[PDB]
Amino acid sequence: KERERLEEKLEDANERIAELVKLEERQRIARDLEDTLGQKLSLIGLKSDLARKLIYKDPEQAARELKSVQQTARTSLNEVRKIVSSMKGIRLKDELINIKQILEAADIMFIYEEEKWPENISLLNENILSMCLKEAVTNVVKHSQAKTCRVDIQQLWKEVVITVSDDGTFKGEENSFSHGLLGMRERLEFANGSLHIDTENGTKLTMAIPN
């Protein structure tokens, strides 16, 4: 069908658009890595070039240089270790700890038991779920007046499914997607996931993302 051809066109436009934010992101990352490491690497180079020129002439200075070359590398590598760790975002295991602290501080009972924990989820999808989990619980604390909050995080079939339930009262209108609820839905749907809500006996959010 000619519809297949249209979807080609839609996919190309979406990829063309994406590439302009990707190209911008690269341009930013690059300028900042070259800032924090661009001198350090250039230094490792010169200091090792000089140490080679002194090996026979002044072996003592060659050693001194090498001690420095070695030191600036170890710290550069350590900087990188930090940079990469940071670029990778909120891990779901870490978000679970954040929500336990938040719920306890709010005098809301937190109910969670590990079952079917995702063995492998992409760092992106993990970060999206962390963001949604944080928001679901922020909403419980700010609005529900709940005394209990139950979180379930399971790898079911080809999805990671998170449910956040509370025993408070839902405060929104018939259509509460205007902000966090619509924000979570849009971010999940971009990832070919979904967000469903049940507001009968308190509020229950079911969020799923492929895995």
Next chain:
Amino acid sequence: RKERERLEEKLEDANERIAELVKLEERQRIARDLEDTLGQKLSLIGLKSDLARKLIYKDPEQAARELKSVQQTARTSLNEVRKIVSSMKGIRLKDELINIKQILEAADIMFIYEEEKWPENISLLNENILSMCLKEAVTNVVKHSQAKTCRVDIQQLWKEVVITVSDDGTFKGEENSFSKGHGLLGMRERLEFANGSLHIDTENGTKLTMAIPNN
């Protein structure tokens, strides 16, 4: 009425949310590359330099060989970090923009620009010529104008890139301010050689209009 303004906003707010996720997806792709690229080459630089130190007296020849590869390894690591922007698309002018913001702020001169309206897809040569002229136009503002404001506009119109540098100070030059070996004539000669142009208006402060072919 302006209910559409609230909807137009609703939309760009969403669009930007999706933008931040495709940005995050990239950030992740880059960390994995760095993890291998830098991580490994830095781990190697470390060991190879550690060994090089242990062979200074034992085998000075091998210590040298190691150091040659430690320099080689470091030189590429840095060039792999330059290569994570596999475009070079309008980057010298974007770096000059940073330089002139610093210079104008240091001089207590308000800098008026629109970062988003800046051309890419100009030849690297013509981009570098414009960077040089932009630097000089602003050096002149700082050294001579006594301006409180400086406005830079960079526009891609038809097959020219046009840069205007305006200031609200007072022009200090003579009837003919284009002197051998100095900036105004220098910029004009360099631009004209590139089939570009330089024009000046010294009525309400000083305004320079510089144009160069795209290429």
Next chain:
Amino acid sequence: MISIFIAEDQQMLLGALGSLLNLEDDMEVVGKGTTGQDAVDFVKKRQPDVCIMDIEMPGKTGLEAAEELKDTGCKIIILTTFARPGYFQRAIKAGVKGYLLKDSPSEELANAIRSVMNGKRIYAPELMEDL
């Protein structure tokens, strides 16, 4: 004399490590490999005292190789550049005797080999849930 096998997929690093360890009077690199399978095959067949093992290698990882060698009398020391999550828990469950950083000074690697041979468990603080 301590017999060592080194499993490291990056040849430059593999060669530099072997060179760094052969410098020691009480140590000897008896074999070199680039995959987890190379490690399982050599250790089961040649039985070196110690196996220096990188984690991420093609085919079988050093963690997978360590799991296959859990019961063999060989003392495994893991070498990594980064601490990806769960690497530590998988390492200790596999019974790794050492889990160190690739870029830790050479003096500290030789020290860990001797300590491990003395029945000690040597884990880099950096590579365990830090700060």
